[model samples]
Target: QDPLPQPIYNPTEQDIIDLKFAIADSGLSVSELVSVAWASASTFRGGDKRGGANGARLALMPQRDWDVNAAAVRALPVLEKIQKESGKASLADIIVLAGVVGVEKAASAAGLSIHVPFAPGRVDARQDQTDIEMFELLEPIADGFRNYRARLDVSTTESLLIDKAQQLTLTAPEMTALVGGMRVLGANFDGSKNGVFTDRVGVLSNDFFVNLLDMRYEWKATDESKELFEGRDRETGEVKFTASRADLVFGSNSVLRAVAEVYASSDAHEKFVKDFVAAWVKVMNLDRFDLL
Candidate 1:
C-alpha cells in the first residue's frame, strides 16, 4: 500500500489573491499589519520558540485572547475562509502571508519601494495541540516589548508595562529598523497615531527616525496615568502626542541611539527603507521549522 498523501499547506497564487481580499475585508490597517508581524515574529529568541508567532498558533480560535491577539482574532475569520477554500493550506502560513501582503500593499499604496521576503511552509497548531499556559505567556498586551497605548486616558499606561525581554534578541540596527517600520505601519497597540513619527501614518518611510532624532520631548501625563510623556516643538510648546518608553529606548541607549542617528539623517532615508524591509523579512521568518 502507498503512504497517505499530506495536505498542501503551501500557498498558491489564488491563495495569495484570497489573502489580499481578506486583509482588505478585515479592515487591517498599517498598524494592524505591524501588530501581527511583530507579535508573530516575537515568538522566537536565542534560537528557540517561546510559543508566540512561530506556528501561526495564535490564529487558532480558542488560542485567541482579547488583549494579546485581538488583531489576530479580528483577522482569523477572514483567514478561515481562505483556509477552507485552500483545502490543505495552513491557516498559520496564510495569516502570516496575509500580513506580508498587507505590508507590501500599504507600502506600495504609499509609493515606498519595500518588499518582504516570503516562503510558504509554515505549519499551524490547532487549539488542542498547543500549551495554553505557554500561549498565555506569548500574549502581546499583558507584558509586551512593543505594547503602547494610543489613548492617553487609559488607567494602565504603556510605560507601566514590563518588556518581558521579548525583543532583546534583535540587534541594534534590526531593532531600529523594526521600530521605524512599525511606526510607519502605525503599529501601536491602541491603533492611534504614533506622535513620535507624526502624520506619516500608513506610509513606509524614514520619518520615524528623522522625527525621533529631530524632536525634543519631556515626560507628561494625564490624571489617569503617570507613566506617559509627550514630544514638543519646544520653541512653540505644541503638544505632539504621547510617546512610548519602548520607542524612546532606541534614542536613549547609546548604541541604539547611534543606529537611530544613521537612519535619521537625510542622506540615509533610502538605506533606512531597505534595511527596514530586510529586518521585517528576518522577523517574519524566525519561526520556520523547515529552515534548519
Candidate 2:
C-alpha cells in the first residue's frame, strides 16, 4: 500500500534470445505473434503520448477486449507464460521482443537478414495503473492497415488509416511500406483473406504492392457499400483477389500511389524490406522515450 516507485528489471541478450526460440517453438506462427505487438504498439497516440507497448497494458482490461486487439489475445497467454517463466523481463518487454523475433523470422523467410532494434527496458503497467474508460477512446473503430472495420457505417477508410499512421507519427512512405509488409505477413484482422494480395503469406514479400499495381486484374465493386471489392482477371472475368477500400487506397490516391510504386518496382524488393523494417522499428520504439 506504499506510494513509492516499483523496482524495474530487464532481460539480458541471451535471455531474450532464448525466449525467442521458445516462442518460435510454440504452436503459433510468426504472423500471430507479430500481430500481438502491432496490436499494442499501434495504440500510441502522438497527440497525447498515452498508449504503446511500454506498459503491456494490452494484457490488462478494456484493451484486452478491443476488437482490433482480439487476434493478439489468442497469443497473449502464450507470451505471458514466456514472460512469467523468464523471470527476466516484463510483459511489456517480452511482447515487444517476441514481435521483433517474428519480424526477423519473417525477413529471413523472405531471404533477407536484418535486425529490428529492441531496447530492453519497457516496464509493465498494472491493472490499477490503467484508466479503462480513458483507454477505451483509443479503441479503433476501424484499423485500415490491418483490414479491420467494426461497422458498415464509417467515413473514408483511407483517411481513418492516415489518422492511425499520424497517431503513430508515421510518414507516407513508412505507412506504405508497413501496410505491404503487414498484408504479406498474413496479419489481417480475424485472419480474413481480404487484402491478402500475396500467394505466399507470412514471407514478408513485397507481393502486396506488386500485385496492387498489376493491370491484369480489373477491380469491381462487390457490394452496396463499395468498400468491398473483387479483382477479376481482365480477359476471363475469373475473380483473382478480394480487397477493401483500405488495400486499394494505396493505389487510388496519386501521392500514395507514388510511394506504393517505389515498393512495387522490380528492383525495389530489398528496398521495401529495409524501409519496412526501419518504419517498423520506429513504431515499436516510439514510446521508448526512456531511451530518447
Candidate 3:
C-alpha cells in the first residue's frame, strides 16, 4: 500500500526551540543531546581509522572515551548560552557536567586523553541517574555498544598476544617452552591453537588464568620501559613493538616458566598445564581472531 502525503508541515524557529526544550526536559541537557551527535561522529572516526569489517578489533576504548569527553567539553559553551537565554539551569544540566567527568575517568583508563570544559560555572547536581533511566536504552542500544566493546577488548588483546607469542618463538627461549608445550599437546593441526590438538582445552585454560585472573591486557611498550609487544603498521605493512604490561609476556617469573622446563608430565597433566601456558603465550601475542 502506498502512503499518501497530505498536509505539509514545516517547523518554525520557535518550534525548533520548543523541540529542543522538549528533548532537554527528558532528563538530558539540550547540549547533552548535542553530545550524542558528536559521539556518533567520533565513534565513526574511530571505526574508519580501524578499517575493515573485522577491523573493529583494533578499536581502543580510549578513543571512544576521549570522544565522549570532548563531546562534554564541546557542549559547555552551548550549555552556557542556552542557560543564559532561558535564565535558568536545571538539575539535569548539572548532571551532564558530572557525567562528562565520568567519561574522562573511563577514557583515562583506556590511555586516552581527557577533555572537558574547564569552566566551573556549571554547578554539580548531586542528583543521580535512576537505574531505569541509565538502562532505558540498554535492551537494544547500550547492549549493542557493550557487546562491541567486549568483543573488541578480547580481540585486541588476542592480536597483541598472538603477535607477541609468535615473535617469542622466533626469538625468546622461555617462550619456546610455552609454544613447544602446545606443539606436543596432540592438538589438531591448525592455527587455532597454533597447530596443536588440545581443542577447547587450551583456550579455556588460557582464558581462566591468563586472561581472567590477570585481567586481559594487550602487549605494547611503555612510555618509560621499552619491552617488546606486537602490532602492525598499517602503512608500513610491518610488525612493530608497543607497550608490554605485567613485566614479561605473562608476567615476570611466572610459574609457567618452571612448568615449561619439564616435559615428562602425564598426557592429561601435560595437556592441561602445558596447553594453559601455551595459550597464555598465544593470547598474549594474538592480534585478532575471526570468531563467528
Candidate 4:
C-alpha cells in the first residue's frame, strides 16, 4: 500500500460531468459551484485517509498521470453552456472555473496533453464573507497538522496551529495550484490574469502587493493526539515547540510550505498574484460573489 491511502473518491471525468448535472439538476447556479468546489475540496481534505497534505497533493495530480485533461475537459462544455445562457456572472462562481483554467495550463506546462471542457452558466452569489468565516472555511480543510501534538489540541487557540492560521501567506500547496492554473489558462501579461495583485501600495513599501484576500484560523477541536511539542525555552522552562499542530503556524509564517516543499512555494508565490487576479476576473463574470 502507499504511505498515503488512496482518496475515497478522486475527481473523475465522469464525476466532473456528474457535478455539472448535479449543479444544473438541482437548479443551483454555477455560483453555487464555487462554494461547492471549495466545499468539495475541503471535504476531500478532511475525509481523505491520507490526510490534508495528501489531499492538497491530489488537487494537483490526476489519478493516473495520463488522466491529465480529464476533469477540465469535462468541465468546459458546462461553462460554455452557461455563457450561451447568460453573460452576467459573479466573481465567486468563476474562481473554480479559473482554477480549471489554471489546472489545464499547469498540466500542459508540465508537458501533458489533455483537453478539458468548461461551460459558462454559473451565476454569482454576490455575498461578502467575513474573515472569520473565510478562516473557518479554510480551517478544517487544512487542519490536520494539529494531530502531531497534544498540547495544541488542549490549548486550542494557543497552539501554533491557530496562531499561524491568522497570519496566512501563500503556502506551497496554494502556490502549486495557482501557478499551474496560470500556465494552463494562457493568461496574458497586462490583463487581470497577469498580476494585478502584485506591486506595492506605499511609497516605501511600494514593492509589496496587497493580499488577495484575508485569512482566518482559530481553534476547532482538542484531544487530537498526545505529547505536546517538548522543546524548552530553558529560561522560562516552557516547551517552545512540539511536533503536533505545528503546520498551521508554520504554514502561516511560511514554515510548512518552507519545509515540506521549498522550490514549490518559491515558484508558485511569484505566479499566484497573477493567477489569483485572473481567477477573480473570470469569476466576476458569474452571478454572485462570495469574497473570502
Computed on alpha carbons, the lDDT of every model, listed in order, comes to 0.62, 0.86, 0.31, 0.31
Q: Write down the TM-score of every candidate.
A: 0.79, 0.95, 0.19, 0.24
Candidate topping lDDT: 2
The full ranking of all candidates by TM-score, starting with the best, is 2, 1, 4, 3
- The regions of model 4 sitting more than 4 angstroms off are 1-88, 117-119, 128-151, 154-292
Predicted candidate 3 versus true structure: per-residue lDDT over 86-111, tens digit per residue: 53333233323323333333233334
**For candidate 1, lDDT tens digit of each residue in 62-179?**
3466465566466566667767765545766666776687677657766775667776776766556677766655444433235444344444432333233334345667767777
Clashes of 4: 43
lDDT tens digits by residue: candidate 4, 1-292: 3255322333445645544343445333322233223322222222223211111221232211112223323334454465335434322233354444444433344444434444343333111212223323333322221122222343553343343323222344443333323222322111222211223211111011212111221222224353223333445655333322332233334544343243234344444444444433332222222232
Residue-level lDDT tens digits of model 2 in 32-146: 8789989878888885767888999999988998877878889999989987787788888888887888899899998988888888888988878898888888889788778
Candidate 1, overall lDDT? Answer: 0.62
lDDT of 1 at 277: 76
Against the correct fold, how does model 4 do in TM-score?
A: 0.24
Candidate 1 TM-score to native: 0.79
Identify the leading candidate in terms of TM-score.
Answer: 2
lDDT, candidate 2, residue 181? 92
**Residue 88 Cα positional deviation in candidate 3, in Å, after optimal superposition:** 25
**Candidate 4 local lDDT, residue 11:** 43
